Design a protein around this ligand. Structure first.
Ligand SMILES: N[C@@H](CCc1cccnc1)P(=O)(O)C[C@@H](Cc1ccccc1)C(=O)O
Ligand SMILES: [Zn+2]
Length: 864
């Protein structure tokens, strides 16, 4: 069963009203539905998706003639006019380890419906172009379930003499079923409010455990900031007088935008400085923003079909990036976003699971909540912004909502809103939705007479879904530096300026930058203006000039990245030839300048001292030995560590001083700590024995989690027993904080020590570990699967381990297992010995009777 976009057809039925009734007992919950059904194609069978235990079905109040087959219920005898259907199902939420539909967590009940979880609750037309008005009644024992929530407005409630109580929630906004939510439990509430720009108070309520309530404050402030920002930046106002957020410790993903009732992984809502890093705080801000921004880009306007997922996710990711960027540190955060795309999305586009931003087919939709749909999706939205400007982009946004408020629509409709609102043709732009793979740009430059002549070619490789790739519309933002690193002006399309966006639309084009009276070096793809690989012949000296003087953060950072990549390549050569390592003279000169530069933003400086990951380094290679790339990258880090050791200590000292004991989260304090932690990593690489000095003063330095995590990270690969002691003391200290225990398990799984696999196997039996908790499984096993020297061990032990855990986890949580199995995506690019072992691992997974569609789809893409 493959699903194809080309086969889309409007539904035979609409559902105008969805009246639900939840009767929560022990152990079962009984759900009653009443659907008000409107025929679209009169006389067709009514087909309802569903997998819950079915107790009864009525049509117009009478027992229905129907047939149950697989996960579908079909009623052939349908009235020709408006009618009702009533379905009664039974659920055992404590047995639901998939964490989709209605499930138990921490003695409480939660839902996760996106994409296709609602059908695990009742029988429904569970597809997002079917939008209905929901009213939800919930009945439960009061002392056990004092908090009973669903979407919208609480319009009634009461008590019974047997100790049960009930509530009724009316959500007046038509919605697809994936936006339904319910929570029932004993939770503590944190209350606040926001007043909208039209003067309406919005009650804000965050629900958490009693013990967790003191950590929810930053999330609350972030929501209020996100509400204000959507008004000032996008002109978007909230549309209910209540906004609820619920934290849950067992959750497959990060968070969920259910209308008026967001549900969040604890990880993206709970923090204090004692237990959360600065990066965790930034994450809460981003994801609280994200889910709130969905209220318009996702909820008010939703998705016609799941192939259009990027319509809401690319756009909402763009929105959360712009929110965070407007809050603080825009340039640094932009680089962080680019770095994540290239480290994680580029390998997806190069690999067996590559897909377009708008896929043309899928087997299991849960497999398509991807780096491509999200992060490349956001880069595609951002290119509208680059082409149109902020004002034009907002014209498009405005027309999009005018046209499509209350509708379930497509990527094509967003593009058309952008095109029409600005009176321009964006037909070619559509290929960013339909063509997979990373475009590669080859560029060359010459100054002939007084014209700088920039020639650019584009190619887009075949991907498993599609061989033909046509030229795309690719904005390339550029500038020129003279020998003094000064900006040079040029003429383009009758305008004298220091910067231009060159729009590449053909397979090959030459751009004429006229009126250039001195030798120049071009600055290319400024701000990472398109999601592409660009090759330009820069000398090392050219890269130093860019790094030292360019006015664009990305191009400066990319110049450093390139020097690092060249240094690693040189290391690969010498290690292969069995000779002494290179000197890296120009690189060291550059880093020396970076370290000593007092004008550089500290978080930017930290980025300039970050070396590309192994995956970046082996991008484009065949017959990969991951350990050789790891060895080469490690050698470079060893050299930087030992070579600059006195400056690492000096810089560390400055960062400590300038932090000024301001241990709470702020972007300013955080940038000092970020730099501090880079220094710590290098200091402990150069001098492993320094760990005992660190351990003696650990209490003194452990002033927040950013420091404890920074320290434990720096020592994590240390072969001293003290590494093991410090980690054990960390687990003891924070044993009662599940999000901190996640950090412990990540350190266990990610260690470059020789004994990591046996330590990981011991950690599986830790009293605070649970394989059935996705945060825990991800932290320990996910980290191990990304641990290059251990996952890719020559003896195949890493492959056998991860395949064992994919097999085990798939039995109860196919989503976690299918994410994990993608650790094998590099299969066909490996050298023959590891490739053989990875194939054996995948065939063994494939051999499992009852293997999920989730994992099966991925294994097929790799093997077949
Ligand atoms: N609609 C949610 C995903 C639901 C989902 C997810 C996975 C599988 N099935 C369903 P989200 O996109 O708002 C949250 C993102 C986190 C995020 C937030 C901000 C920026 C990027 C990603 C996530 O939880 O994945
Ligand atoms: Zn989202």
């Amino acid at each position: 069963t493959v699903h194809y976009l080309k086969d889309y057809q409007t539904p035979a039925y609409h559902i105008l009203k969805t009246d639900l009734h939840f009767d929560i007992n022990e152990p079962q919950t009984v759900v009653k539905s009443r659907l008000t059904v409107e025929p679209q194609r009169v006389g067709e069978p009514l087909v309802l998706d569903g997998s819950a235990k079915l107790l009864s079905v009525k049509i117009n109040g009478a027992a229905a003639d129907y047939v149950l087959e697989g996960e579908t219920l079909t009623i052939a005898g349908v009235p020709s006019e408006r009618f009702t259907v009533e379905v009664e199902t039974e659920i055992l939420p404590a047995e639901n380890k998939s964490l989709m539909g209605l499930y138990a967590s921490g003695g409480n009940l939660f839902t996760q419906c996106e994409p296709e979880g609602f059908r695990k609750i009742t029988f429904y037309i569970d597809r997002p172009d079917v939008m209905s008005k929901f009213t939800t009644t919930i009945v439960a024992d009061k002392k056990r379930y004092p908090v009973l929530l669903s979407n919208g407005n609480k319009i009634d409630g009461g008590e019974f003499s047997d100790g049960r109580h009930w509530v009724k929630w009316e959500d007046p906004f038509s919605k697809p079923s994936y936006l339904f939510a319910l929570v029932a439990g004993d939770l503590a509430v944190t209350e606040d409010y926001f007043t909208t720009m039209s003067g309406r108070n919005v009650k804000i309520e965050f629900y958490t455990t009693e013990a967790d309530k003191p950590k929810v404050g930053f999330a609350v402030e972030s929501l209020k900031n996100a509400m204000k920002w959507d008004e000032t930046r996008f002109g978007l106002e909230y549309d209910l007088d209540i906004f609820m957020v619920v934290a849950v410790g067992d959750f497959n993903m990060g968070a969920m935008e259910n209308k008026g009732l967001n549900i969040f992984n604890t990880k993206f809502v709970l923090a204090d400085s004692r237990t959360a890093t600065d990066t965790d705080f930034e994450g809460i801000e981003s994801v609280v923003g994200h889910e709130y921004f969905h209220n318009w880009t996702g909820n008010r306007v939703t998705c016609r079909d799941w192939f259009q997922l990027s319509l809401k996710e690319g756009l909402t990711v763009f929105r959360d990036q712009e929110f965070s960027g407007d809050r603080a540190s825009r340039a640094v955060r932009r680089i962080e976003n680019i770095r994540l795309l290239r480290q994680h999305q580029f390998p997806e586009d190069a690999g067996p699971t590559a897909h377009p931003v708008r896929p043309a087919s899928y087997e299991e939709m849960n497999n398509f909540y991807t780096m491509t749909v999200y992060e490349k999706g956001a880069e595609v939205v951002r290119m509208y912004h680059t082409l149109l400007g902020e004002e034009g982009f907002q014209k498009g946004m405005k027309l999009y909502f005018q046209r499509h408020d209350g509708q379930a629509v497509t990527c094509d409709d967003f593009r058309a809103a952008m095109a029409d609102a600005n009176g321009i043709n964006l037909d070619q732009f559509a290929l960013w939705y339909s063509q997979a793979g990373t475009p590669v740009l080859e560029a060359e430059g010459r100054l002939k007479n007084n014209i700088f002549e920039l020639t650019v070619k584009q190619t887009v490789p075949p991907t498993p879904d599609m061989t033909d790739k046509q030229p795309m519309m690719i904005p390339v933002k550029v500038g020129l530096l003279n020998r003094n690193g000064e900006a040079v002006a040029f003429d383009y399309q009758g305008k004298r300026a220091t910067e231009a966006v060159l729009l590449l639309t053909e397979a090959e084009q030459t751009f004429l930058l006229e009126g250039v009276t001195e030798a120049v070096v071009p600055s290319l793809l400024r701000g990472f203006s398109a999601p592409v690989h660009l090759n330009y012949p820069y000398s090392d000296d050219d890269l130093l000039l860019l790094l030292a003087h360019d006015s664009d953060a990305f191009t400066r950072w990319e110049a450093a990245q390139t020097l690092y990549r060249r240094a690693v390549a040189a290391n690969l050569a010498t290690l292969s030839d069995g000779v002494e390592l290179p000197k890296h003279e120009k690189l060291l000169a550059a880093v020396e300048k970076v370290i000593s530069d007092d004008l550089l933003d500290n978080a930017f400086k930290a980025l300039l001292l970050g070396v590309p990951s192994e995956a970046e380094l082996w991008d484009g290679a065949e017959n990969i030995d991951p350990l050789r790339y790891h060895q080469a990258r490690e050698a470079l880090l060893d050299t930087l560590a030992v070579h600059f050791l006195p400056k690492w200590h000096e810089l560390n000292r400055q960062a400590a001083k300038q932090e000024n004991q301001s241990y709470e989260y702020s972007p300013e304090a955080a940038g000092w700590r970020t730099l501090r932690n880079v220094c710590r990593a290098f200091v402990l690489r150069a001098d492993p024995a320094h760990i005992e000095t660190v351990a003696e003063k650990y209490g003194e330095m452990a002033q927040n989690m950013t420091h404890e995590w920074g320290i434990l990270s720096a020592v994590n690969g240390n072969e001293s027993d003290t590494r093991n002691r410090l980690l054990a003391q960390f687990a003891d200290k924070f044993s009662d904080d599940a999000l901190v225990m996640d950090k412990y398990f990540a350190l266990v799984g990610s260690s470059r020590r020789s004994d990591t696999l046996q330590q990981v196997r011991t950690a599986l039996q830790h009293p605070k570990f649970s394989l059935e908790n996705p945060n825990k499984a991800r932290s320990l096993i996910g980290s191990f699967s990304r641990n290059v020297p251990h996952f890719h061990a020559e003896d195949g032990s890493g492959y056998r381990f991860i395949a064992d855990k994919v097999i085990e986890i798939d039995r109860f949580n196919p989503q976690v297992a299918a994410r994990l199995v993608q650790a094998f995506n590099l299969c066909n690019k490996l050298e023959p010995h590891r490739k053989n072992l990875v194939k054996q691992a995948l065939q063994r997974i494939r051999a499992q009777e009852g293997l999920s569609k989730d994992v099966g789809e991925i294994v097929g893409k790799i093997l077949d």
